[PDB]
Amino acid sequence: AFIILDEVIKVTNRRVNAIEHVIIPRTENTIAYINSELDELDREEFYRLKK
Amino acid sequence: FAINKKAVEQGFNVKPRLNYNTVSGVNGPLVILEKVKFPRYNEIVNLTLPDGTVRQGQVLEIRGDRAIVQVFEGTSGIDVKKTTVEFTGESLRIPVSEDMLGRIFDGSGRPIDNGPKVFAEDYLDINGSPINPYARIYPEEMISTGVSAIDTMNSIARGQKIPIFSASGLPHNEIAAQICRQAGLVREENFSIVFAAMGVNLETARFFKQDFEENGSLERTSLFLNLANDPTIERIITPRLALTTAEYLAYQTERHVLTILTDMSSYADALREVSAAREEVPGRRGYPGYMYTDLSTIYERAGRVEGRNGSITQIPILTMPNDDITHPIPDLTGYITEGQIFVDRQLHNKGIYPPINVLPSLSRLMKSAIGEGMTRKDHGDVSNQLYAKYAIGKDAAAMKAVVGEEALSIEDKLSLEFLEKFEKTFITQGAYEDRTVFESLDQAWSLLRIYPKEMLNRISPKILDEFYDR
Amino acid sequence: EYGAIYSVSGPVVIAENMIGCAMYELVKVGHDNLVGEVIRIDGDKATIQVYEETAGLTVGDPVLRTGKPLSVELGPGLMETIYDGIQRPLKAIKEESQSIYIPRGIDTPALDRTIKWQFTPGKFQVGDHISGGDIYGSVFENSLISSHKILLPPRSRGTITWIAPAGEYTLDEKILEVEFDGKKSDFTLYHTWPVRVPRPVTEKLSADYPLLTGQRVLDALFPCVQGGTTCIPGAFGCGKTVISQSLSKYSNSDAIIYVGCGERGNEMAEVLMEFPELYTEMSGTKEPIMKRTTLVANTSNMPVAAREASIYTGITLAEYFRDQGKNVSMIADSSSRWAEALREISGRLGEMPADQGFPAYLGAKLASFYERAGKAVALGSPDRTGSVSIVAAVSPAGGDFSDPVTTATLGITQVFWGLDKKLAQRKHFPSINTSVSYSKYTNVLNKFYDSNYPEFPVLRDRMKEILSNAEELEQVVQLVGKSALSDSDKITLDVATLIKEDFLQQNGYSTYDAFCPIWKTFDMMRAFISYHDEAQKAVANGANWSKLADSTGDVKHAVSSSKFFEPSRGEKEVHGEFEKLLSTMQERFAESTD
Known part of the structure; x- marks a missing residue:
């Protein structure tokens, strides 16, 4: 039981660390980039309509 | 004498100028005249509000017998029945002379130090003209700034144009002050300074003034100050005046100028401000399309020339809006300038001064700078090895933080130790701690000895044999 | 004949009294005759793009024409x-x-x-028929280019009536006359x-x-x-x-x-x-x-x-x-x-x-x-x-x-x-x-390769697949570690790093690392692939790669340093050196692996 618990907790802890330190930053940077692009499009659309 | 005199004999050429009274339109920062006789593109006019105050401005468009004058100091209060516009008949120009040194000027270049008007030697158009490439020589001499992070892995040559990226709330001002205080050559002291700040708070201006006072250098420099309270449109003029003075000094007096602009971000903001006033096509993030060309015009006054012994060097300071390199301002600035020095947050958050990282820094003129007659052959290889090991240490630290210490090979722990020692001792230095290239490189050798000799790859065997042993 | 400026906006100028102007016709403007290029035409007025700085221009300045494009x-x-x-x-x-x-x-x-040029006549004689694009003599220009062929401009044809003889001429001389319906041709x-x-x-x-x-x-x-x-x-x-x-x-x-x-x-x-x-x-x-x-x-x-x-x-x-x-x-x-x-x-x-x-x-x-x-x-x-x-x-x-x-x-x-x-x-x-x-020119080049280097195409794909597999394993090893890695995967990663550090790095300052002929790269990548193949064969035959690599040792250093060979030494001396290195590496894998 000791061995099994040790290996299981090691695996889960490293997985949690990897998720926290990799996934969330990677996705939120993309979120910001997408927001920036969608904000960019409307600017030129408004310019064209103004013209 | 006679040669010089013939170039000035045309001064005695009095010419009356006509002042109209037909202001027939106004909106935003623009004023529209009518029934003007033979306009002249991009000239200077002097308005006179009904209360007697006079503002300046230049025409930007010429339709059939009507000029769209643009005003600098706002347009509020302009009357249509009493105002009187006047034409100088010539483009914008400023006086110049070697006596400007030790004086302080406002954004428009008039003295603000209680002194008299400059006893001009001649007048010059602010915009200047390009330099044909055939009359240009790239530099091959290294300046010694004393800052190890610069003078080791990113050298500076007399003639380069190296911007200093930065973020709001960091000690870029102190870095610039230290550089100007330690602007000596590797090896007189002709380094005149034409510091020209636009859109800055009062404390920055006073700090710069005191810093110049303490080093006994004010008598060797000129100041172009333009604080925030001043009009925005006028902002875009100061750098041109500064560069005009710098080039005059460096190409008609054989001096060695050293210009340090600041907050080009504010200049770009002013460009956006009076660019959206009109309806010209926007670029990215609402910025003007031709900002690239304008910034090229501003920056492309650098380097040495054929005949003149004089030189010039630009160290503009940028302010990234939200700590993004991909912002258009730094994008174009990097596209133009020759390498740059960078600053990070975490290093500053870690109390490390000067908080300079080197991974994103770059300098093209290093190849011509380093060599034998100025430094030891090892110079370049040492820097390359430092780059490689620093990057490996960074990635190893990231991976270790991810997984743990179990998978970190011996080399990984060595890289972590090297990174720690590097960032803790190699970069850190005092506010008045100089470091000539020789001692800095000697100290740098200490950090690499931690590594076993064989693994060192990017360094040639001769350097290892002749230097590693000691 | 002439036109007056009517409106200016930085680099764009609009003139008037411009009737005979065509589109894209070259024009000279200003009292200094700045060069321009008409773009759009609207009645009398015609927009012009200016090819120089436009500062101080004044309405009423004369505008000229040239009638010919840039x-x-x-x-x-x-x-x-x-x-x-x-x-x-x-x-x-x-x-x-x-x-x-x-x-x-x-x-x-x-x-x-x-300056004058030492001209020499071509091979045509009076009374012959010529058409646009035919050479009628060479001209000495430089030691690197001995023959600077001179040509008859296209859209110009006829029969030559008089030609100049050999000698020294300036490029203003009329050295050839072409007789079309009329004799209106000089060149x-x-x-x-x-x-x-x-x-x-x-x-x-x-x-x-x-x-x-x-x-x-x-x-x-x-x-x-x-x-x-x-x-x-x-x-x-x-x-x-x-x-x-x-x-x-x-x-x-x-x-x-x-x-x-x-x-x-x-x-x-x-x-x-x-x-x-x-x-x-x-x-x-x-x-x-x-x-x-x-x-x-x-x-x-x-x-x-x-x-x-x-x-x-x-x-x-x-x-x-x-x-x-x-x-x-x-x-x-x-x-x-x-x-x-x-x-x-x-x-x-x-x-x-x-x-x-x-x-x-x-x-x-x-x-x-x-x-x-x-x-x-x-x-x-x-x-x-x-x-x-x-x-x-x-x-x-x-x-x-x-x-x-x-x-x-x-x-x-x-x-x-x-x-x-x-x-x-x-x-x-x-x-x-x-x-x-x-x-995209990969397939077509086989005609050259088979004649010169038949084996190159298979080997490039060998390296491409090696690199792709390394890039596919990097993320898994990063997210998990080397714990769940077999010996072959570690071999692949090591060889990928070796390639990235040796076959992909270059510096145009070292004498040997400034220009790599085709043969040098061919032999080097050949050696790389052979090394990896021998390592894979040995590990498949059975051996702890952790033990095997240390014994292998100096051969890895030799293949890494192979690039240091001086290019253009003999073009065959280097070939023999590569052959010897391959042979000794194969012998080492035969014995060191044992």
Whole structure:
């Protein structure tokens, strides 16, 4: 039981660390980039309509 | 004498100028005249509000017998029945002379130090003209700034144009002050300074003034100050005046100028401000399309020339809006300038001064700078090895933080130790701690000895044999 | 006859009383006769784009006409000199003015009109029949180019009535007369041609000869054919200047036309004073390179409009040299600057924009410009052959690969050399993203390869799959670690790192690492693949790779250091050295693995 618990907790802890330190930053940077692009499009659309 | 005199004999050429009274339109920062006789593109006019105050401005468009004058100091209060516009008949120009040194000027270049008007030697158009490439020589001499992070892995040559990226709330001002205080050559002291700040708070201006006072250098420099309270449109003029003075000094007096602009971000903001006033096509993030060309015009006054012994060097300071390199301002600035020095947050958050990282820094003129007659052959290889090991240490630290210490090979722990020692001792230095290239490189050798000799790859065997042993 | 200015807005000028004006006709404006180009015509008025600074212009200034479009003067003397964007020699301007700036409105002949050339007649005699594109004599130009063929301009044909004899002439002499219906024809050593009209040609062809570049990765994985096109994106830090300079220097082209559209400018001085001492041995020996180049420099500081005509002038000159039968190879510096100039002009003109503010015809313009490249057979009797191979270098704004200009270019070009930023930051100087970068002339080149190196194609794919597998395993090992890794996977990762550190790194400063012939790279990558194959065979036969690698030892160092062999030693001595290294490595794996 000791061995099994040790290996299981090691695996889960490293997985949690990897998720926290990799996934969330990677996705939120993309979120910001997408927001920036969608904000960019409307600017030129408004310019064209103004013209 | 006679040669010089013939170039000035045309001064005695009095010419009356006509002042109209037909202001027939106004909106935003623009004023529209009518029934003007033979306009002249991009000239200077002097308005006179009904209360007697006079503002300046230049025409930007010429339709059939009507000029769209643009005003600098706002347009509020302009009357249509009493105002009187006047034409100088010539483009914008400023006086110049070697006596400007030790004086302080406002954004428009008039003295603000209680002194008299400059006893001009001649007048010059602010915009200047390009330099044909055939009359240009790239530099091959290294300046010694004393800052190890610069003078080791990113050298500076007399003639380069190296911007200093930065973020709001960091000690870029102190870095610039230290550089100007330690602007000596590797090896007189002709380094005149034409510091020209636009859109800055009062404390920055006073700090710069005191810093110049303490080093006994004010008598060797000129100041172009333009604080925030001043009009925005006028902002875009100061750098041109500064560069005009710098080039005059460096190409008609054989001096060695050293210009340090600041907050080009504010200049770009002013460009956006009076660019959206009109309806010209926007670029990215609402910025003007031709900002690239304008910034090229501003920056492309650098380097040495054929005949003149004089030189010039630009160290503009940028302010990234939200700590993004991909912002258009730094994008174009990097596209133009020759390498740059960078600053990070975490290093500053870690109390490390000067908080300079080197991974994103770059300098093209290093190849011509380093060599034998100025430094030891090892110079370049040492820097390359430092780059490689620093990057490996960074990635190893990231991976270790991810997984743990179990998978970190011996080399990984060595890289972590090297990174720690590097960032803790190699970069850190005092506010008045100089470091000539020789001692800095000697100290740098200490950090690499931690590594076993064989693994060192990017360094040639001769350097290892002749230097590693000691 | 004359016209008066009617409105000015920076670089655009609108005149009036302009009735006989055509579209795109060249015009001179101002009291200093600044050059322009009519664009749109509306009754009396006609819009003009100005090719110089417009400061101090006043309404009422006279406007002239020329009745002919923009054109460039070809002929002897073009080469070894430096021109601005509108075909003006630069050294002559500086010497004549004794200044450091460019005096607005200054005019000089395109080609020197004083020097004399040792002309020799061709093979035609009075009474013969000739047509456009036939040679009628050679001219001595330089030790590197002994024969500077002179040509009959296209769209001009007849029968020669009088010819000049051998001797020394200036290019103003009328050395040939052609008798058409009338005798209205005279021809000196030079002529002109409208830039916007591509030069005629007998017929195009298929390029099947590699354009050697001297770069290991470029020549190995993404070969460029002599006659095609390429593209080199960047992020203002990738250091693309290195490959441009290296290919302009050590390539096997007969001539090269470097053109700078919106450059830092200082690089022009760098190349100016760097080339004059770098010798080539293509013909004879020791001839300095500067006798093999023509520079069309236009710094970003100089007026916006000239950035348009600069590339047209460059491509036209390249076509002219190609027509002589010499495999010229033009190279641009920054196409994005051209698009920026076009966008600025369009916006100022006041017209509806397109994607990201750019006009709508930019894609068509880019396609038309790129189409001019390609191998072909000259137009004339001698039946000479030439080729052109342009190499553009786009520069996006945000550093990504989604801006309109890059997307438009990628639909036209057929070779893609993307440049990463992080790899450059790591000083892995030939930083090429081997994931997205691709070539398209791979299959066709087999005709050359089988004749010269039959085994190369299989080996390149071997390395490609090795790298792909390493990149596929990197993320899993990062997210898990080496705990769940088999020996073969570790072997693959180690060899991938070895390749990335040895076969992909280069530096154009070491004598041995400045130019890698085809044979050297062939043998080196052969050795790499053989090493990996022997390691895989041994581990499959059974052995702990952790134990095996330490014993293997010095052979890994030997293959890593193989690149240090001096290129051009014997071309066969190095071949024997590679053979011996392979044999000893195989013996080591036979025994060390045991």
